[PDB]
Structure 1
Amino acid sequence: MEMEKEFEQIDKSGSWAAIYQDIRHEASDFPSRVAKLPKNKNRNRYRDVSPFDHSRIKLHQEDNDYINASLIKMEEAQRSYILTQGPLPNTVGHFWEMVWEQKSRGVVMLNRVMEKGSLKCAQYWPQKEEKEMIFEDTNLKLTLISEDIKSYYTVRQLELENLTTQETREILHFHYTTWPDFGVPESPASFLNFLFKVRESGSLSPEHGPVVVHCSAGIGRSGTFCLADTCLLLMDKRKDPSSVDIKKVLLEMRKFRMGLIQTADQLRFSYLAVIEGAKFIMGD
Protein backbone atom coordinates (compact mmCIF):
# COMPACT_ATOMS: atom_id res chain seq x y z
CA MET A 1 0.00 0.00 0.00
CA GLU A 2 1.00 3.65 -0.28
CA MET A 3 2.30 5.30 2.89
CA GLU A 4 -0.09 8.15 3.77
CA LYS A 5 -3.21 6.03 3.39
CA GLU A 6 -1.73 2.96 5.03
CA PHE A 7 -1.00 5.46 7.82
CA GLU A 8 -4.62 6.58 8.24
CA GLN A 9 -5.78 2.97 7.98
CA ILE A 10 -3.57 2.00 10.95
CA ASP A 11 -4.68 5.04 12.95
CA LYS A 12 -8.39 4.37 12.38
CA SER A 13 -7.93 0.68 13.19
CA GLY A 14 -5.60 1.35 16.14
CA SER A 15 -3.22 -1.45 15.14
CA TRP A 16 0.23 0.18 15.54
CA ALA A 17 1.26 -2.32 18.26
CA ALA A 18 0.41 -5.27 16.00
CA ILE A 19 2.29 -3.83 13.01
CA TYR A 20 5.33 -3.18 15.22
CA GLN A 21 5.27 -6.67 16.74
CA ASP A 22 5.24 -8.16 13.22
CA ILE A 23 8.45 -6.26 12.46
CA ARG A 24 10.02 -7.59 15.67
CA HIS A 25 9.05 -11.15 14.71
CA GLU A 26 10.50 -10.94 11.18
CA ALA A 27 13.73 -9.12 12.11
CA SER A 28 17.09 -10.77 11.49
CA ASP A 29 19.00 -12.61 14.22
CA PHE A 30 22.78 -12.78 13.74
CA PRO A 31 25.52 -13.63 16.26
CA SER A 32 27.12 -10.97 18.50
CA ARG A 33 29.84 -13.12 20.08
CA VAL A 34 32.57 -10.48 20.34
CA ALA A 35 30.24 -8.10 22.25
CA LYS A 36 29.57 -10.81 24.86
CA LEU A 37 33.20 -11.69 25.69
CA PRO A 38 33.88 -11.02 29.41
CA LYS A 39 36.67 -8.56 28.64
CA ASN A 40 34.12 -6.28 26.89
CA LYS A 41 31.51 -6.02 29.67
CA ASN A 42 32.44 -2.47 30.61
CA ARG A 43 32.32 -1.44 26.91
CA ASN A 44 28.55 -2.04 26.67
CA ARG A 45 25.95 0.30 28.20
CA TYR A 46 23.05 -2.19 28.00
CA ARG A 47 23.34 -5.97 28.16
CA ASP A 48 20.56 -6.48 25.58
CA VAL A 49 21.92 -4.06 22.91
CA SER A 50 24.94 -5.43 21.02
CA PRO A 51 26.43 -5.06 17.52
CA PHE A 52 26.27 -8.09 15.22
CA ASP A 53 29.70 -9.59 14.46
CA HIS A 54 29.30 -9.25 10.67
CA SER A 55 28.66 -5.47 10.70
CA ARG A 56 30.53 -4.25 13.81
CA ILE A 57 33.08 -1.44 13.50
CA LYS A 58 36.59 -2.60 14.37
CA LEU A 59 39.06 -0.29 16.10
CA HIS A 60 42.55 -0.36 14.51
CA GLN A 61 44.19 -1.75 17.61
CA GLU A 62 45.67 -5.17 18.28
CA ASP A 63 44.90 -5.40 22.01
CA ASN A 64 41.14 -4.99 21.87
CA ASP A 65 39.35 -3.86 18.71
CA TYR A 66 35.83 -3.76 20.20
CA ILE A 67 33.36 -0.85 20.29
CA ASN A 68 29.55 -1.06 20.49
CA ALA A 69 28.97 0.36 16.96
CA SER A 70 27.54 -0.97 13.66
CA LEU A 71 27.89 -0.08 9.94
CA ILE A 72 24.46 0.28 8.26
CA LYS A 73 25.17 0.12 4.46
CA MET A 74 22.08 0.96 2.32
CA GLU A 75 22.87 -0.26 -1.20
CA GLU A 76 20.03 1.19 -3.34
CA ALA A 77 20.03 4.54 -1.52
CA GLN A 78 23.84 4.74 -1.67
CA ARG A 79 24.06 5.95 1.95
CA SER A 80 25.99 4.52 4.93
CA TYR A 81 25.64 5.28 8.65
CA ILE A 82 27.52 4.20 11.78
CA LEU A 83 25.06 3.72 14.67
CA THR A 84 26.56 3.61 18.18
CA GLN A 85 25.66 3.86 21.90
CA GLY A 86 26.29 7.03 23.88
CA PRO A 87 29.92 6.87 24.97
CA LEU A 88 30.76 5.55 28.48
CA PRO A 89 33.40 7.00 30.84
CA ASN A 90 35.77 4.22 29.73
CA THR A 91 34.96 4.43 25.97
CA VAL A 92 35.26 8.17 25.09
CA GLY A 93 38.77 7.62 23.72
CA HIS A 94 37.54 4.65 21.63
CA PHE A 95 34.65 6.78 20.29
CA TRP A 96 36.98 9.48 18.91
CA GLU A 97 39.42 6.82 17.62
CA MET A 98 36.53 5.44 15.53
CA VAL A 99 35.59 8.89 14.19
CA TRP A 100 39.22 9.37 13.11
CA GLU A 101 39.79 5.93 11.59
CA GLN A 102 36.47 5.88 9.69
CA LYS A 103 37.07 9.41 8.21
CA SER A 104 33.71 10.72 9.42
CA ARG A 105 32.89 14.41 9.04
CA GLY A 106 29.84 14.61 11.31
CA VAL A 107 28.52 13.27 14.64
CA VAL A 108 24.71 13.32 15.21
CA MET A 109 23.61 13.28 18.89
CA LEU A 110 19.89 12.80 19.61
CA ASN A 111 19.87 12.74 23.45
CA ARG A 112 20.79 15.03 26.35
CA VAL A 113 23.64 14.05 28.69
CA MET A 114 21.05 13.81 31.54
CA GLU A 115 17.46 12.69 30.92
CA LYS A 116 14.87 11.50 33.49
CA GLY A 117 17.37 12.42 36.24
CA SER A 118 19.97 9.86 35.13
CA LEU A 119 23.11 10.02 33.00
CA LYS A 120 22.49 8.82 29.41
CA CYS A 121 26.06 9.34 28.07
CA ALA A 122 29.41 10.80 29.08
CA GLN A 123 30.30 14.48 28.52
CA TYR A 124 32.53 13.48 25.61
CA TRP A 125 33.24 16.90 23.97
CA PRO A 126 34.66 20.16 25.46
CA GLN A 127 32.29 22.89 26.57
CA LYS A 128 34.79 25.80 26.48
CA GLU A 129 37.22 26.81 23.72
CA GLU A 130 40.12 27.28 26.17
CA LYS A 131 39.60 23.87 27.94
CA GLU A 132 40.50 21.20 25.39
CA MET A 133 40.34 17.43 26.02
CA ILE A 134 43.17 14.91 25.70
CA PHE A 135 42.39 11.20 25.38
CA GLU A 136 45.58 9.52 26.50
CA ASP A 137 44.57 5.91 25.78
CA THR A 138 44.11 6.66 22.02
CA ASN A 139 46.44 9.70 21.65
CA LEU A 140 43.90 12.25 20.37
CA LYS A 141 43.23 15.90 21.21
CA LEU A 142 39.82 17.53 20.82
CA THR A 143 39.14 21.31 20.82
CA LEU A 144 35.88 23.28 20.69
CA ILE A 145 36.17 25.81 17.81
CA SER A 146 32.68 27.39 17.77
CA GLU A 147 29.14 26.73 18.97
CA ASP A 148 25.79 27.89 17.52
CA ILE A 149 22.81 27.41 19.90
CA LYS A 150 19.36 27.41 18.27
CA SER A 151 15.91 26.74 19.69
CA TYR A 152 15.73 23.01 18.83
CA TYR A 153 19.37 22.05 18.22
CA THR A 154 23.00 23.16 18.63
CA VAL A 155 25.81 22.87 16.01
CA ARG A 156 29.44 22.77 17.10
CA GLN A 157 32.67 22.92 15.13
CA LEU A 158 35.35 20.73 16.68
CA GLU A 159 39.01 20.08 15.81
CA LEU A 160 40.35 16.55 16.22
CA GLU A 161 44.14 16.09 16.24
CA ASN A 162 45.94 12.77 15.95
CA LEU A 163 48.83 13.45 18.34
CA THR A 164 50.93 10.64 16.82
CA THR A 165 51.06 12.28 13.37
CA GLN A 166 50.04 15.91 14.15
CA GLU A 167 47.34 15.67 11.46
CA THR A 168 44.15 17.64 12.16
CA ARG A 169 40.54 17.47 10.93
CA GLU A 170 37.36 19.49 11.33
CA ILE A 171 34.39 17.56 12.80
CA LEU A 172 30.82 18.92 12.91
CA HIS A 173 28.65 18.03 15.99
CA PHE A 174 24.87 18.18 15.34
CA HIS A 175 23.00 18.00 18.67
CA TYR A 176 19.22 17.65 18.68
CA THR A 177 18.40 18.99 22.15
CA THR A 178 14.60 18.89 22.36
CA TRP A 179 13.44 15.26 22.04
CA PRO A 180 11.06 14.85 25.04
CA ASP A 181 12.03 12.69 28.04
CA PHE A 182 8.92 10.51 27.41
CA GLY A 183 7.27 9.62 24.09
CA VAL A 184 8.00 11.26 20.70
CA PRO A 185 7.60 14.84 19.36
CA GLU A 186 4.07 15.95 18.52
CA SER A 187 5.14 17.33 15.11
CA PRO A 188 8.06 16.11 12.97
CA ALA A 189 8.81 19.63 11.72
CA SER A 190 11.80 20.42 13.95
CA PHE A 191 13.28 16.92 13.46
CA LEU A 192 13.05 17.27 9.65
CA ASN A 193 14.57 20.76 9.79
CA PHE A 194 17.43 19.22 11.80
CA LEU A 195 17.89 16.38 9.27
CA PHE A 196 18.09 18.92 6.43
CA LYS A 197 20.76 20.89 8.33
CA VAL A 198 22.88 17.73 8.70
CA ARG A 199 22.44 17.05 4.96
CA GLU A 200 23.36 20.61 3.99
CA SER A 201 26.68 20.34 5.90
CA GLY A 202 28.12 17.54 3.68
CA SER A 203 28.25 15.12 6.64
CA LEU A 204 26.08 12.49 4.87
CA SER A 205 27.80 12.70 1.47
CA PRO A 206 30.02 10.09 -0.26
CA GLU A 207 33.17 12.25 -0.20
CA HIS A 208 33.37 11.57 3.57
CA GLY A 209 33.30 8.48 5.78
CA PRO A 210 29.93 7.47 7.28
CA VAL A 211 28.23 9.84 9.71
CA VAL A 212 28.30 8.68 13.34
CA VAL A 213 24.81 8.78 14.94
CA HIS A 214 23.93 8.01 18.56
CA CYS A 215 21.39 8.37 21.33
CA SER A 216 21.68 6.44 24.62
CA ALA A 217 21.47 2.86 23.23
CA GLY A 218 21.91 3.75 19.53
CA ILE A 219 18.77 1.98 18.23
CA GLY A 220 15.68 4.07 18.97
CA ARG A 221 15.94 7.78 18.10
CA SER A 222 19.04 6.85 16.06
CA GLY A 223 16.98 4.39 14.02
CA THR A 224 14.33 7.03 13.39
CA PHE A 225 16.96 9.42 11.96
CA CYS A 226 18.49 7.01 9.42
CA LEU A 227 15.14 5.42 8.48
CA ALA A 228 13.64 8.81 7.61
CA ASP A 229 16.75 9.95 5.68
CA THR A 230 16.97 6.75 3.58
CA CYS A 231 13.23 6.65 2.75
CA LEU A 232 13.26 10.27 1.54
CA LEU A 233 16.34 9.64 -0.63
CA LEU A 234 14.69 6.60 -2.24
CA MET A 235 11.53 8.64 -3.00
CA ASP A 236 13.73 11.11 -4.91
CA LYS A 237 15.62 8.40 -6.81
CA ARG A 238 12.79 6.12 -8.04
CA LYS A 239 10.38 6.62 -10.95
CA ASP A 240 7.48 5.73 -8.62
CA PRO A 241 7.90 7.30 -5.14
CA SER A 242 4.79 5.53 -3.77
CA SER A 243 6.67 2.25 -4.15
CA VAL A 244 8.84 3.08 -1.09
CA ASP A 245 7.83 0.66 1.70
CA ILE A 246 8.98 1.97 5.08
CA LYS A 247 8.53 -1.41 6.80
CA LYS A 248 10.73 -3.13 4.20
CA VAL A 249 13.41 -0.44 4.53
CA LEU A 250 13.36 -0.86 8.33
CA LEU A 251 13.76 -4.65 8.05
CA GLU A 252 16.72 -4.11 5.67
CA MET A 253 18.36 -1.78 8.22
CA ARG A 254 17.78 -4.36 11.01
CA LYS A 255 20.01 -6.78 9.08
CA PHE A 256 22.89 -4.51 10.27
CA ARG A 257 21.94 -3.56 13.88
CA MET A 258 19.34 -5.07 16.21
CA GLY A 259 16.35 -3.29 17.66
CA LEU A 260 16.10 -0.21 15.39
CA ILE A 261 12.90 1.66 16.32
CA GLN A 262 12.14 0.74 19.95
CA THR A 263 8.39 1.42 20.26
CA ALA A 264 5.21 1.55 18.19
CA ASP A 265 5.14 5.30 18.88
CA GLN A 266 8.58 5.68 17.27
CA LEU A 267 7.30 3.68 14.26
CA ARG A 268 4.31 5.98 13.85
CA PHE A 269 6.55 9.04 14.20
CA SER A 270 8.85 7.71 11.44
CA TYR A 271 5.85 7.39 9.08
CA LEU A 272 4.78 10.96 9.96
CA ALA A 273 8.26 12.33 9.31
CA VAL A 274 8.61 10.68 5.89
CA ILE A 275 5.09 11.75 4.84
CA GLU A 276 5.56 15.41 5.77
CA GLY A 277 9.10 15.47 4.43
CA ALA A 278 8.04 14.20 1.02
CA LYS A 279 5.84 17.29 0.57
CA PHE A 280 8.54 19.77 1.43
CA ILE A 281 11.04 18.16 -0.91
CA MET A 282 8.94 19.21 -3.90
CA GLY A 283 8.98 20.19 -5.03
CA ASP A 284 6.97 22.27 -2.52
Structure 2
Amino acid sequence: MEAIPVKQFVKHIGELYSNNQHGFSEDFEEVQRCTADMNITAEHSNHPENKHKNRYINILAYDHSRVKLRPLPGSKHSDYINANYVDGYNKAKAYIATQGPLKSTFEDFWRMIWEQNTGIIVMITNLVEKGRRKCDQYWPTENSEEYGNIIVTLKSTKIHACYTVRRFSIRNTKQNERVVIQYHYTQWPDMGVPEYALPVLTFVRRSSAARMPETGPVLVHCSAGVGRTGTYIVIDSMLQQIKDKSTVNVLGFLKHIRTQRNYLVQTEEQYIFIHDALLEAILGK
Protein backbone atom coordinates (compact mmCIF):
# COMPACT_ATOMS: atom_id res chain seq x y z
CA MET A 1 0.00 0.00 0.00
CA GLU A 2 1.91 3.02 -1.32
CA ALA A 3 1.81 5.92 -3.78
CA ILE A 4 -0.28 5.26 -6.88
CA PRO A 5 0.90 7.05 -10.03
CA VAL A 6 -1.53 9.84 -10.87
CA LYS A 7 -2.17 8.22 -14.26
CA GLN A 8 -3.45 4.95 -12.81
CA PHE A 9 -5.41 6.55 -9.97
CA VAL A 10 -8.37 7.50 -12.13
CA LYS A 11 -8.67 3.93 -13.36
CA HIS A 12 -8.35 2.85 -9.73
CA ILE A 13 -11.41 4.97 -8.94
CA GLY A 14 -13.44 3.16 -11.59
CA GLU A 15 -12.44 -0.08 -9.93
CA LEU A 16 -13.32 1.14 -6.42
CA TYR A 17 -16.74 2.31 -7.66
CA SER A 18 -17.64 -0.90 -9.45
CA ASN A 19 -20.04 -3.51 -8.12
CA ASN A 20 -21.82 -0.96 -5.96
CA GLN A 21 -18.72 0.61 -4.48
CA HIS A 22 -17.47 -2.68 -3.02
CA GLY A 23 -13.86 -1.49 -3.34
CA PHE A 24 -14.59 1.77 -1.54
CA SER A 25 -16.27 -0.19 1.25
CA GLU A 26 -13.23 -2.45 1.73
CA ASP A 27 -10.91 0.56 1.87
CA PHE A 28 -12.95 2.55 4.35
CA GLU A 29 -13.61 -0.49 6.55
CA GLU A 30 -9.85 -0.92 6.62
CA VAL A 31 -9.61 2.73 7.63
CA GLN A 32 -12.05 2.24 10.48
CA ARG A 33 -10.16 -0.85 11.64
CA CYS A 34 -6.77 0.85 11.26
CA THR A 35 -6.72 1.72 14.97
CA ALA A 36 -8.14 -1.58 16.25
CA ASP A 37 -4.82 -2.52 17.82
CA MET A 38 -4.19 0.99 19.11
CA ASN A 39 -5.00 2.41 22.51
CA ILE A 40 -4.72 6.17 22.13
CA THR A 41 -5.20 8.18 25.30
CA ALA A 42 -7.42 11.23 25.60
CA GLU A 43 -7.36 11.82 29.35
CA HIS A 44 -7.69 15.57 29.19
CA SER A 45 -10.79 15.42 26.96
CA ASN A 46 -12.37 13.08 29.50
CA HIS A 47 -11.49 15.03 32.62
CA PRO A 48 -14.63 16.23 34.46
CA GLU A 49 -13.33 19.78 34.20
CA ASN A 50 -13.22 19.73 30.41
CA LYS A 51 -16.51 17.96 29.64
CA HIS A 52 -18.46 21.17 29.02
CA LYS A 53 -15.74 22.06 26.50
CA ASN A 54 -16.54 19.15 24.18
CA ARG A 55 -19.38 19.65 21.68
CA TYR A 56 -19.92 15.89 21.48
CA ILE A 57 -19.13 13.55 24.37
CA ASN A 58 -17.73 10.90 22.04
CA ILE A 59 -15.60 13.21 19.91
CA LEU A 60 -12.31 13.69 21.73
CA ALA A 61 -8.85 15.16 21.21
CA TYR A 62 -6.01 12.62 21.50
CA ASP A 63 -3.49 13.63 24.19
CA HIS A 64 -0.31 13.35 22.16
CA SER A 65 -1.50 15.61 19.35
CA ARG A 66 -3.85 17.92 21.27
CA VAL A 67 -3.27 21.66 20.88
CA LYS A 68 -2.37 23.18 24.23
CA LEU A 69 -3.46 26.60 25.41
CA ARG A 70 -0.99 28.54 27.55
CA PRO A 71 -2.28 28.00 31.12
CA LEU A 72 -4.07 30.76 33.05
CA PRO A 73 -3.52 31.88 36.69
CA GLY A 74 -3.49 31.16 39.38
CA SER A 75 -7.13 26.73 36.41
CA LYS A 76 -5.18 23.51 35.88
CA HIS A 77 -7.33 22.69 32.86
CA SER A 78 -7.32 26.13 31.26
CA ASP A 79 -4.93 24.54 28.77
CA TYR A 80 -7.54 22.32 27.13
CA ILE A 81 -9.39 22.85 23.87
CA ASN A 82 -10.86 20.07 21.73
CA ALA A 83 -8.35 20.33 18.89
CA ASN A 84 -5.42 18.38 17.41
CA TYR A 85 -2.45 19.13 15.19
CA VAL A 86 -2.68 17.07 12.01
CA ASP A 87 -0.03 16.49 9.36
CA GLY A 88 -0.31 17.83 5.87
CA TYR A 89 1.63 16.50 2.91
CA ASN A 90 4.33 19.14 3.17
CA LYS A 91 4.92 19.65 6.89
CA ALA A 92 4.04 18.05 10.20
CA LYS A 93 1.28 19.86 12.10
CA ALA A 94 0.15 21.68 8.94
CA TYR A 95 -3.38 21.87 10.35
CA ILE A 96 -5.26 22.32 13.54
CA ALA A 97 -8.40 20.19 13.26
CA THR A 98 -10.99 21.31 15.82
CA GLN A 99 -14.72 21.26 16.62
CA GLY A 100 -17.05 24.13 15.82
CA PRO A 101 -16.56 26.43 18.85
CA LEU A 102 -19.18 26.62 21.60
CA LYS A 103 -20.11 29.95 23.16
CA SER A 104 -18.39 28.64 26.30
CA THR A 105 -15.15 28.07 24.39
CA PHE A 106 -15.05 31.18 22.15
CA GLU A 107 -12.21 32.73 24.18
CA ASP A 108 -10.17 29.53 24.11
CA PHE A 109 -10.81 29.32 20.40
CA TRP A 110 -9.49 32.79 19.62
CA ARG A 111 -6.72 32.52 22.18
CA MET A 112 -5.51 29.37 20.42
CA ILE A 113 -5.59 31.20 17.10
CA TRP A 114 -3.46 33.96 18.58
CA GLU A 115 -0.99 31.71 20.41
CA GLN A 116 -0.58 29.43 17.37
CA ASN A 117 -0.11 32.30 14.93
CA THR A 118 -2.93 30.87 12.80
CA GLY A 119 -3.77 33.07 9.83
CA ILE A 120 -6.41 31.06 7.96
CA ILE A 121 -9.69 29.57 9.16
CA VAL A 122 -11.51 26.94 7.12
CA MET A 123 -15.13 26.50 8.22
CA ILE A 124 -16.91 23.53 6.67
CA THR A 125 -20.42 23.71 8.11
CA ASN A 126 -23.24 26.20 8.49
CA LEU A 127 -24.28 27.37 11.94
CA VAL A 128 -27.54 25.47 11.50
CA GLU A 129 -28.23 22.59 9.14
CA LYS A 130 -31.57 20.89 8.57
CA GLY A 131 -32.93 22.68 11.63
CA ARG A 132 -30.05 21.40 13.76
CA ARG A 133 -27.41 23.29 15.74
CA LYS A 134 -23.99 22.64 14.23
CA CYS A 135 -21.83 25.59 15.27
CA ASP A 136 -22.17 28.79 17.32
CA GLN A 137 -21.15 32.05 15.68
CA TYR A 138 -17.68 32.86 16.97
CA TRP A 139 -17.22 35.98 14.84
CA PRO A 140 -18.81 39.47 14.63
CA THR A 141 -21.75 39.92 12.25
CA GLU A 142 -20.37 43.43 11.73
CA ASN A 143 -17.68 45.68 13.18
CA SER A 144 -16.00 44.27 16.27
CA GLU A 145 -16.51 41.72 19.02
CA GLU A 146 -14.39 40.92 22.07
CA TYR A 147 -13.47 37.42 23.18
CA GLY A 148 -11.25 37.51 26.23
CA ASN A 149 -8.17 39.50 25.28
CA ILE A 150 -8.75 39.08 21.58
CA ILE A 151 -10.83 41.69 19.78
CA VAL A 152 -12.04 40.63 16.36
CA THR A 153 -12.93 43.11 13.64
CA LEU A 154 -14.71 42.12 10.42
CA LYS A 155 -13.06 44.08 7.62
CA SER A 156 -14.70 42.71 4.50
CA THR A 157 -16.75 39.87 3.08
CA LYS A 158 -17.13 38.29 -0.33
CA ILE A 159 -20.06 35.92 -0.72
CA HIS A 160 -19.64 33.41 -3.53
CA ALA A 161 -22.12 30.85 -4.86
CA CYS A 162 -20.78 28.06 -2.65
CA TYR A 163 -18.64 29.74 -0.01
CA THR A 164 -17.94 32.98 1.81
CA VAL A 165 -14.62 34.68 2.50
CA ARG A 166 -14.47 36.98 5.53
CA ARG A 167 -11.36 39.05 6.24
CA PHE A 168 -10.86 39.84 9.92
CA SER A 169 -8.30 41.91 11.77
CA ILE A 170 -7.73 40.66 15.30
CA ARG A 171 -6.05 42.46 18.15
CA ASN A 172 -4.59 41.20 21.42
CA THR A 173 -5.32 43.73 24.17
CA LYS A 174 -2.67 41.88 26.22
CA GLN A 175 -1.93 46.47 20.55
CA ASN A 176 -0.45 43.91 18.16
CA GLU A 177 -2.68 43.08 15.19
CA ARG A 178 -2.98 40.28 12.63
CA VAL A 179 -5.03 39.49 9.55
CA VAL A 180 -7.09 36.32 9.82
CA ILE A 181 -9.02 35.14 6.77
CA GLN A 182 -11.97 32.79 7.11
CA TYR A 183 -13.03 30.50 4.26
CA HIS A 184 -16.56 29.34 5.00
CA TYR A 185 -18.18 26.71 2.76
CA THR A 186 -21.86 27.54 2.83
CA GLN A 187 -23.62 25.22 0.38
CA TRP A 188 -25.32 22.41 2.29
CA PRO A 189 -28.35 20.47 0.96
CA ASP A 190 -31.72 20.49 2.73
CA MET A 191 -31.95 16.83 1.76
CA GLY A 192 -29.20 14.24 1.74
CA VAL A 193 -25.53 15.06 1.32
CA PRO A 194 -23.21 16.95 -1.05
CA GLU A 195 -22.58 15.15 -4.34
CA TYR A 196 -20.73 17.28 -6.93
CA ALA A 197 -17.05 17.77 -6.07
CA LEU A 198 -15.94 20.57 -8.40
CA PRO A 199 -17.12 23.55 -6.29
CA VAL A 200 -15.36 21.96 -3.32
CA LEU A 201 -12.15 21.48 -5.30
CA THR A 202 -12.19 25.19 -6.08
CA PHE A 203 -12.83 26.02 -2.43
CA VAL A 204 -9.89 23.82 -1.42
CA ARG A 205 -7.50 25.36 -3.96
CA ARG A 206 -8.29 28.94 -3.05
CA SER A 207 -8.34 28.47 0.70
CA SER A 208 -5.12 26.43 0.50
CA ALA A 209 -3.35 29.00 -1.67
CA ALA A 210 -4.23 31.65 0.92
CA ARG A 211 -1.77 30.10 3.39
CA MET A 212 1.13 32.44 4.15
CA PRO A 213 4.78 31.51 4.71
CA GLU A 214 5.67 31.23 7.38
CA THR A 215 2.68 31.13 9.69
CA GLY A 216 0.91 28.87 12.13
CA PRO A 217 -1.16 25.84 11.08
CA VAL A 218 -4.42 26.36 9.18
CA LEU A 219 -7.45 25.94 11.44
CA VAL A 220 -10.03 23.57 9.93
CA HIS A 221 -13.35 22.88 11.61
CA CYS A 222 -16.79 21.65 10.83
CA SER A 223 -19.18 20.67 13.62
CA ALA A 224 -17.45 17.77 15.39
CA GLY A 225 -14.26 18.66 13.55
CA VAL A 226 -13.59 15.14 12.22
CA GLY A 227 -15.65 14.16 9.16
CA ARG A 228 -15.74 17.13 6.79
CA THR A 229 -12.57 18.40 8.43
CA GLY A 230 -10.69 15.19 7.62
CA THR A 231 -12.08 15.25 4.09
CA TYR A 232 -10.64 18.72 3.52
CA ILE A 233 -7.29 17.69 4.98
CA VAL A 234 -6.93 14.62 2.75
CA ILE A 235 -8.04 16.44 -0.41
CA ASP A 236 -5.69 19.35 0.26
CA SER A 237 -2.72 17.13 1.15
CA MET A 238 -3.19 14.79 -1.80
CA LEU A 239 -3.33 17.73 -4.20
CA GLN A 240 0.01 18.86 -2.76
CA GLN A 241 1.37 15.36 -3.29
CA ILE A 242 0.04 15.21 -6.83
CA LYS A 243 1.62 18.58 -7.66
CA ASP A 244 4.93 17.51 -6.15
CA LYS A 245 5.31 13.85 -7.15
CA SER A 246 2.32 13.14 -9.40
CA THR A 247 1.34 10.27 -7.12
CA VAL A 248 -1.56 9.76 -4.74
CA ASN A 249 -1.90 7.85 -1.49
CA VAL A 250 -5.38 8.46 -0.07
CA LEU A 251 -5.68 5.27 1.98
CA GLY A 252 -2.19 5.48 3.49
CA PHE A 253 -2.36 9.18 4.35
CA LEU A 254 -5.79 8.79 5.94
CA LYS A 255 -4.74 5.85 8.12
CA HIS A 256 -1.83 8.00 9.31
CA ILE A 257 -3.79 11.09 10.31
CA ARG A 258 -6.39 8.86 11.98
CA THR A 259 -3.78 8.43 14.74
CA GLN A 260 -3.76 12.23 15.21
CA ARG A 261 -7.49 12.88 15.63
CA ASN A 262 -10.25 10.31 15.99
CA TYR A 263 -12.63 9.69 13.09
CA LEU A 264 -11.10 12.02 10.51
CA VAL A 265 -13.18 11.39 7.37
CA GLN A 266 -16.21 9.90 9.06
CA THR A 267 -18.28 8.18 6.36
CA GLU A 268 -17.74 6.09 3.27
CA GLU A 269 -19.52 8.83 1.30
CA GLN A 270 -16.93 11.40 2.39
CA TYR A 271 -14.21 8.89 1.59
CA ILE A 272 -15.64 8.52 -1.93
CA PHE A 273 -16.03 12.29 -2.25
CA ILE A 274 -12.28 12.68 -1.67
CA HIS A 275 -11.67 10.59 -4.76
CA ASP A 276 -14.16 12.60 -6.85
CA ALA A 277 -12.42 15.83 -5.89
CA LEU A 278 -9.03 14.42 -6.89
CA LEU A 279 -10.50 12.90 -10.04
CA GLU A 280 -11.82 16.37 -10.98
CA ALA A 281 -8.36 17.84 -10.37
CA ILE A 282 -6.62 15.24 -12.53
CA LEU A 283 -9.12 15.24 -15.39
CA GLY A 284 -9.20 19.02 -15.44
CA LYS A 285 -5.64 18.44 -16.66
Tell whether the structures are fold-level matches, with TM greater than 0.5: yes
Contact residue 155 and residue 166 of structure 2 kept, 8 A: yes
> Is 1:226 aligned to residue 233 of structure 2?
yes
Give the whole-Å Cα distance in 2 for the aligned partners of 1:183 and 1:220. 15
Matched, 1:107 2:121: yes
RMSD (CA atoms): 1.6
Secondary structure, aligned partner of 1:39: coil
The offset of 1:206, in angstroms, is: 3.9
Distance in 1 (alpha carbons) for counterparts of 2:91 and 2:217 = 11
Residue 170 of structure 1 pairs with residue 182 of structure 2: no
Instruction: Give runs of aligned pairs for residues 116-195 of structure 1, distance below 5 A.
Output: 116-129=130-143, 132-135=144-147, 138-164=148-174, 166-181=175-190, 183-195=192-204
CA distance change for structure 1 residues 144 and 192 in 2, over 3 Å: closer, same or farther? same
Q: Take 2:159 and 2:34, find their aligned partners in 1: how far apart are those partners? A: 41
Query: Following the alignment from structure 1 to structure 2, what is the Cα–Cα distance between the partners of residues 29 and 249?
Result: 20
- CA change 1:213–1:182 in 2 (3 A) is farther
Residues 59-80 of structure 1 deviation map (CA, whole Å, 9 limit, x = unaligned): 0124210000000124x52260
- In 2, Cα distance between equivalents of 1:121 and 1:84: 12
- 2:223 maps to which of 190, 202, 216: 216
Aligned residue number for residue 66 of structure 1: 80
- Residues 145 and 158 of structure 1 are in contact (CA less than 8 Å); yes or no, is this contact kept in structure 2? yes
Distance in 2 between residues matched to 1:263 and 1:183, nearest whole Å: 13
- Distance across 2 between alignment mates of 1:3 and 1:77: 21
Match among 6, 9, 18 for residue 3 of structure 1: 9
| Residue matched to 2:57 | 47
Displacement of 1:7: 1.5
Residue 10 of structure 1, CA deviation: 2.1
Q: 1:249 aligns with which of 247, 253, 257?
A: 253
CA-to-partner distance for each residue in 1:132-164, whole Å, 9 max, x for gaps? Answer: 2112xx311111111111111111111111011
Distance verdict in 2 for CA 1:49–1:153, change over 3 Å: same
The answer to whether residue 90 in structure 2 is matched with residue 77 in structure 1 is yes
Q: 2:205 touches 2:236 (CA, 8 Å); kept in 1?
A: no
Q: Is the 8 A contact 2:170 2:179 kept in 1?
A: yes
% identical aligned pairs: 35
1:158 maps to a residue whose letter is F
**Could you state the TM-score of these two structures normalised by the residue count of structure 1?**
0.90
Q: Which amino acid in 1 is paired with 2:130? A: K
- The Cα of 1:184 is off from its aligned counterpart by 3.7
The residue type paired with residue 276 of structure 1 is: E
1:275 to 263, 274, 279: 279
Aligned match for 1:88, one of 102, 110, 125: 102
Matched AA of 2:26: A
Counterpart contact for 1:3–1:271, Cα < 8 Å: no
CA shift for structure 1 position 181 = 5.0
Whole-Å Cα distance in 2 between the matches of residues 66 and 29 of structure 1? 21
In the alignment, residue 217 of structure 1 is paired with which amino acid? Answer: A
Report the CA distance between 1:115 and its aligned residue. 0.7
Report the TM-score, using the length of structure 2 for normalisation.
Answer: 0.90
2:224 corresponds to which letter in structure 1? A
Q: Unaligned stretches of 5+ in structure 1? A: none
Structure 1 residues 248 and 181, CA, compared in 2 at 3 Å: closer, same or farther?
farther
Q: Which whole-Å CA distance do the structure 1 matches of 2:43 and 2:204 have between them?
A: 34
Amino acid corresponding to residue 200 of structure 1 in structure 2: A
- Which structure 2 segments of 5+ residues have no match? none
Please tell me the residue identity of whatever aligns with 1:277: A
Q: 2:41 aligns with which of 6, 14, 31?
A: 31
For residues 106-128 of structure 1, the C-alpha deviation after alignment (integer angstroms, 9 at most, x for no partner) is: 10001000112121111110111
CA distance in 2, matches of 1:183, 1:265: 11
